[PDB]
Amino acid sequence: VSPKTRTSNLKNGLTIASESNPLVQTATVGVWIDAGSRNENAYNNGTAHFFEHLAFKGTDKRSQHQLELDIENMGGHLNAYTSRESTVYYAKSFKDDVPKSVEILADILQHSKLAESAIDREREVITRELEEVNKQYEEVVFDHLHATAFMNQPLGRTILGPRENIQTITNTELRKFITENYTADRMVLVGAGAVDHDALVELAEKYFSHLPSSQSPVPLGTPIPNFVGSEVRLRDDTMPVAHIAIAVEGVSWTSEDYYTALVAQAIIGNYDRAVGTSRHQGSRLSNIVSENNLANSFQSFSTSYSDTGLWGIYLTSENTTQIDDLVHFTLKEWNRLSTSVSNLQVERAKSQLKAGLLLSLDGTTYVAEDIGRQLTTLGRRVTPAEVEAKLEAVTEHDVRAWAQKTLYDKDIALVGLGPIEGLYDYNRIRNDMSMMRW
Amino acid sequence: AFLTWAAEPEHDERKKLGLKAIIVISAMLGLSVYIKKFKWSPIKNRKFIYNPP
Numbered sequence: 222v223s224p225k226t227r228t229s230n231l232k233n234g235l236t237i238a239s240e241s242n243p244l245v246q247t248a249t250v251g252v253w254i255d256a257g258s259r260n261e262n263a264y265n266n267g268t269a270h271f272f273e274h275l276a277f278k279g280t281d282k283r284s285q286h287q288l289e290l291d292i293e294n295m296g297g298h299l300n301a302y303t304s305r306e307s308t309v310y311y312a313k314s315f316k317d318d319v320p321k322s323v324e325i326l327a328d329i330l331q332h333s334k335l336a337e338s339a340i341d342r343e344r345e346v347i348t349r350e351l352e353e354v355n356k357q358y359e360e361v362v363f364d365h366l367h368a369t370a371f372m373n374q375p376l377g378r379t380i381l382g383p384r385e386n387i388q389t390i391t392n393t394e395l396r397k398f399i400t401e402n403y404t405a406d407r408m409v410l411v412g413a414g415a416v417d418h419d420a421l422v423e424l425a426e427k428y429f430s431h432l433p434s435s436q437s438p439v440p441l442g443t444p445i446p447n448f449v450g451s452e453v454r455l456r457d458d459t460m461p462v463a464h465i466a467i468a469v470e471g472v473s474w475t476s477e478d479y480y481t482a483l484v485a486q487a488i489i490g491n492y493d494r495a496v497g498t499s500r501h502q503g504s505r506l507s508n509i510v511s512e513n514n515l516a517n518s519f520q521s522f523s524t525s526y527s528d529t530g531l532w533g534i535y536l537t538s539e540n541t542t543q544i545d546d547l548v549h550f551t552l553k554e555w556n557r558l559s560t561s562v563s564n565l566q567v568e569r570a571k572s573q574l575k576a577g578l579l580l581s582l583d584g585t586t587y588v589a590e591d592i593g594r595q596l597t598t599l600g601r602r603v604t605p606a607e608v609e610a611k612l613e614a615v616t617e618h619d620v621r622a623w624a625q626k627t628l629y630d631k632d633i634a635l636v637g638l639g640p641i642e643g644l645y646d647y648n649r650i651r652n653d654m655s656m657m658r659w
Numbered sequence: 660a661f662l663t664w665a666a667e668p669e670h671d672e673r674k675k676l677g678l679k680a681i682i683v684i685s686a687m688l689g690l691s692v693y694i695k696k697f698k699w700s701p702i703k704n705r706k707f708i709y710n711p712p
Contacts, residue, residue: 452701646701646702647701648698648701
């Protein structure tokens with residue numbers, strides 16, 4: 222039984238949330254923000270990611286060099302990432318270096334210079350990032366997947382933004398973005414590891430008290446996406462491995478079917494030929510794929526956003542003449558979530574998930590990430606007892622009913638990259654979303 | 660008229676069955692056009708972006 226997550230607020234509406242672990246000597250403090258690329262329009266798309274670069278380029282007090290030195294002297298590191306719906310800035314340090322790290326984070330968020338000289342310098346760095354993501358195939362596949370599934374909608378945009386915007390982002394629009402979005406009612410100060418809650422609340426009162434509040438404070442994790450069944454093919458015969466993602470519209474964080482979608486995802490599960498145990502996994506798709514050498518790997522996913530999600534699978538394969546079999550067998554396993562699953566698969570997946578949801582949190586950064594994610598998506602940290610009860614509530618009838626309305630005979634978004642000549646056209650893929658025998 | 664009947668006594672039945680066939684076949688022709696267009700639309704609508712390597 223893990224220690225209780227303590228939660229306090231300031232007057233501006235900044236949440237402070239902490240989970241102490243007296244067995245570790247490091248601490249992760251940081252700021253989770255309920256804001257990301259999805260808050261940009263088409264003209265300033267790329268701003269949030271641009272800011273993340275400039276946040277480390279110097280503040281009104283410390284210059285770029287002083288900032289570098291200050292963190293080096295702390296002993297730990299700082300890290301940041303911007304996603305579609307969430308931005309994070311955190312600092313891992315020693316137990317007693319926590320007040321320094323809170324002070325540095327408060328500085329780079331509130332008091333960053335955003336000097337025209339630095340904007341102009343990063344404008345080239347970010348331009349080079351556009352031509353080097355090209356190598357991270359999983360990311361290429363998932364960014365095309367969002368672009369097509371949410372065609373011409375904010376969730377469909379990339380985080381980097383178009384080349385055109387990178388050349389035209391000004392310090393004005395950067396400042397406007399962080400003034401509109403980085404407000405106290407959208408922010409959570411999180412501490413995990415060797416942190417005292419009462420100490421962290423004091424540090425928040427010292428550094429984050431002059432944060433603007435938004436005019437209309439909605440609750441944390443408050444959002445209309447119209448999924449497009451569609452396909453992107455990026456054939457490249459010179460690549461040896463095909464990367465394929467298939468997804469349907471999934472569930473939001475606060476859906477009533479959130480746990481049902483996780484259980485369904487665990488029934489298919491993951492596979493990787495490089496792991497020794499993977500040939501012995503219980504999943505039917507795992508057995509088909511391993512016995513027939515259809516794939517190097519597959520990874521089921523159920524990605525959630527505030528108002529939508531994507532549920533699907535990501536496959537990698539060198540077997541270029543049997544891509545058709547791989548896709549066929551995968552979608553016939555999805556069909557069985559509608560037609561065939563019983564208490565056998567459901568109770569096995571529940572067993573595996575009851576542990577999996579706890580196992581994931583195995584270090585201070587994972588704990589901080591869990592507190593921050595849950596506070597910015599649900600407005601509260603959900604206790605493991607509540608999670609165990611929501612999983613236990615999932616029956617085989619729930620899984621069948623969910624799959625029948627979410628998967629069965631539904632449109633998919635499909636992305637293929639690499640030697641995908643053997644991937645059939647959209648209709649033949651989408652025809653495997655149902656079974657004529659049922 | 661009588662001799663015409665003697666040569667082709669199936670005449671009346673044949674033309675009524677032909678009316679039924681014409682109607683059914685025409686409806687099936689119309690539906691087959693809808694279905695062909697429906698199934699072909701992903702191919703007809705396909706778009707390309709080429710970036711020369």
